[PDB]
């Protein structure tokens, strides 16, 4: 699968205006687009990217023959991104004095997508538009653009300098204070909101982001992420009942998909370096042995028991794979989250086509939810995969319902550690003042707030939506090394630390209780 | 706000040591008591070893529990649960919701 992404960039003079104490919107947009391109490049993604800039002094596009659609340039046609685009954007892209609208840029992007998509089959078409909405625009073609978007079924996203004292990029706070917005900006916001709500209904209101927010939300790649491969199986309560189901990996730790290759300093080729393993006996002669002269064994308490690979395979525990069997149903209170094992969480839905399995799974989920019970299941990916015991519990949502499965521990997987109680310890017994101080500290460092007393909680620091900083740091360092081979790695970006740090309000509230606790609580190293 | 299905890594157990810093046991006990009575779990950046990316984790207080024989089964301390990052999640395919008759 592959997709086309057209990035619309405003280089107007208003963007270059850097308000004191706040990073210029142009810098934020450049950072966001650079992060997007870095992720798309270093991730080895078969995606086509093009860049269109409006507001440039020059003009270069198919629809620039006459006086219409001026100050629009196509810096790159649809094609696989490379280091050339990163070098061009990082160094030789500057703001343009001339001011240009954005609907013309959108039309140019549509024309480019239509022209380039003829020669290839693309599953998804995407457009991302980064503007401050400070330029006059013509509303004559609103119907035409809306109809073209509806017919071409291409996703569209908008990024603005302001979201719908000190300022930090991605600091979990207000990026652009709502004091200084001009009438033109209000009109641009209104028109873009109309376009988004018409295109995607009420859900489109969440499709307009901010540069600071987008820098720590992983939203640019929201619509160009490939679906996980479905695992088909049959949930079998007994020998006569079977429901066709499909399982997906809802949560899985993400790592680097590319390894580091060792090459010679003199010649940067892996062929020169050769690694070999030699086996020697425990003797003075250090006689070497061959691979065929080696056997596998195990220790048996000071005794060595040889165990050949063929012997192990013959005596290996044999079972049939691809099984999802319910061993029973137990009260949800009997399963504790602290005992959860494994490195993944499975989401199980019904089959894709049939509806009988859908209704059966819905009935099972509803029964489990209303009876406050979970199903103990035997999970086995394939024949080779070792069988495991896990817990599946219902997960019902307004738009979908499924079964969430998490592995459970075995008897030998548990550790029996005995600790010393703290409640009944005389030496370790905080006084009333200590409890009051800890209460004050906990209250002053609350990460959740009441949502207008609407029986809902709003999260001040939603770490679950924070992207992993290691990938961004690695991409930044790799790009710096590539573009500047004769320079050292740069320091971690400030916005990364801002997104990895709590809002300044919490620290300001906690300043005093923290000092009070420090004064009250003795702390001496030993 | 700690979703049960948001499971990434097996949880760990944090217990006061007092071998390095003296007087930490009382502060740990006070924090455990207040968190238990408030049903609030601490949030902390965790870096196990040197040169390791940090991970956001939640320390949920644990209340000591004993069986009928007065044998420890849930030692007191903190339960460290790893909170997945944005990229640790995956996008599921859209599925129409189908209800079931009573």
């Amino acid at each position: 699968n592959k997709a086309a992404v057209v990035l619309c960039m405003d280089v107007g003079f208003t963007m270059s205006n850097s308000i004191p104490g706040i990073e210029s919107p142009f810098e934020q947009a450049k950072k966001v687009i650079t992060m997007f391109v870095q992720r798309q490049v270093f991730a080895e993604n078969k995606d086509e990217i093009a860049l269109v800039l409006f507001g440039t002094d020059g003009t270069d596009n198919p629809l620039s023959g006459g006086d219409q659609y001026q100050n629009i340039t196509v810096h790159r046609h649809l094609m696989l991104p490379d280091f050339d685009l990163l070098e061009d954007i990082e160094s030789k892209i500057q703001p343009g004095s001339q001011q240009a609208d954005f609907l013309d840029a959108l039309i140019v992007s549509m024309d480019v997508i239509q022209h380039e998509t003829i020669g290839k089959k693309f599953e998804k078409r995407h457009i991302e538009i980064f503007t401050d909405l400070s330029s006059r625009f013509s509303k004559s073609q609103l119907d035409i653009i809306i109809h073209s978007l509806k017919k071409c079924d291409i996703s569209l996203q908008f990024f603005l300098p302001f979201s719908l004292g000190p300022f930090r990029l991605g600091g979990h706070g207000p990026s652009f204070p709502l004091k200084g917005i001009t009438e033109q900006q209000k009109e641009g916001l209104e028109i873009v909101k109309m376009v988004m709500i018409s295109l995607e209904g009420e859900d489109g209101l969440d499709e307009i982001y901010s540069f600071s927010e987008s820098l720590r939300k992983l939203c640019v790649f929201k619509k160009i992420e490939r679906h996980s491969i479905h695992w088909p199986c049959r949930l079998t309560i007994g020998s006569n009942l079977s429901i066709r189901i499909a399982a997906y990996k809802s949560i899985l730790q993400e790592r680097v998909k590319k390894t580091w290759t060792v090459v010679d300093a003199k010649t940067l080729k892996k062929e020169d370096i050769q690694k070999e393993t030699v086996y020697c006996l425990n003797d003075d002669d250090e006689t070497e042995v061959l691979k065929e002269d080696i056997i596998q064994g195990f220790r048996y308490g000071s005794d060595i028991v040889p165990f050949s690979k063929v012997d192990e395979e013959q005596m290996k525990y044999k079972s049939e794979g691809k099984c999802f069997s319910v061993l029973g149903f137990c009260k949800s209170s009997q399963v504790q989250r602290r005992f959860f094992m494994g490195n993944q969480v499975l989401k199980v839905f019904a089959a894709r086509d049939d509806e009988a399995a859908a209704v059966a799974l819905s009935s099972l989920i509803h029964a489990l939810d209303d009876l406050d019970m979970v199903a103990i299941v035997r999970y086995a990916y394939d024949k080779r995969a070792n069988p495991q015991v896990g817990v599946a519990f219902p997960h019902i949502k307004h738009n979908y319902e499924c079964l969430v499965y998490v592995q459970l521990p075995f008897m030998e997987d548990l550790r029996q550690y005995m600790f010393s109680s703290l409640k009944n310890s005389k030496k370790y017994a905080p006084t009333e003042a200590q409890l009051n101080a800890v209460d004050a500290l906990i209250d002053s460092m609350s990460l959740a707030k009441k949502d207008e007393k609407t029986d809902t909680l709003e999260d001040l620091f939603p770490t679950t939506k924070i992207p992993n900083p290691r990938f961004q740091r690695l991409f930044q360092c790799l790009l710096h090394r590539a573009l500047h081979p004769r320079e050292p790695l740069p320091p971690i970006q400030q916005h990364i630390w801002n997104m990895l740090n709590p809002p300044a309000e919490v620290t300001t509230k906690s300043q005093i209780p923290l000092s009070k606790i420090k004064t009250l609580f003795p702390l001496i190293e030993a | 706000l700690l979703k049960k299905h948001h499971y990434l890594r097996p949880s760990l157990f944090v217990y006061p040591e007092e071998s390095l810093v003296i007087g930490s046991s009382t502060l740990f006990s006070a924090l455990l008591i207040k968190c238990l009575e408030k049903e609030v779990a601490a949030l902390c950046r965790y870096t196990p070893r040197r040169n390791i990316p940090p991970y956001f984790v939640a320390l949920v207080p644990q209340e000591e529990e004993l069986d009928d024989q007065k044998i420890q089964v849930t030692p007191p301390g903190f339960q460290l649960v790893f909170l997945p990052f944005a990229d640790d999640k995956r996008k599921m395919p859209f599925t129409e919701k189908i209800m079931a008759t009573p």
Partner: peptide, 24 residues
């Protein structure tokens, strides 16, 4: 201490694995 394993002192005597025992 009650329940202490006779084989490995200092460790609780793990109960035998029963599996699934359907109730009445």
């Amino acid at each position: 201490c009650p329940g202490e394993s006779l084989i490995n002192p200092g460790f609780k005597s793990k109960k035998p694995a029963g599996g699934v025992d359907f109730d009445e």
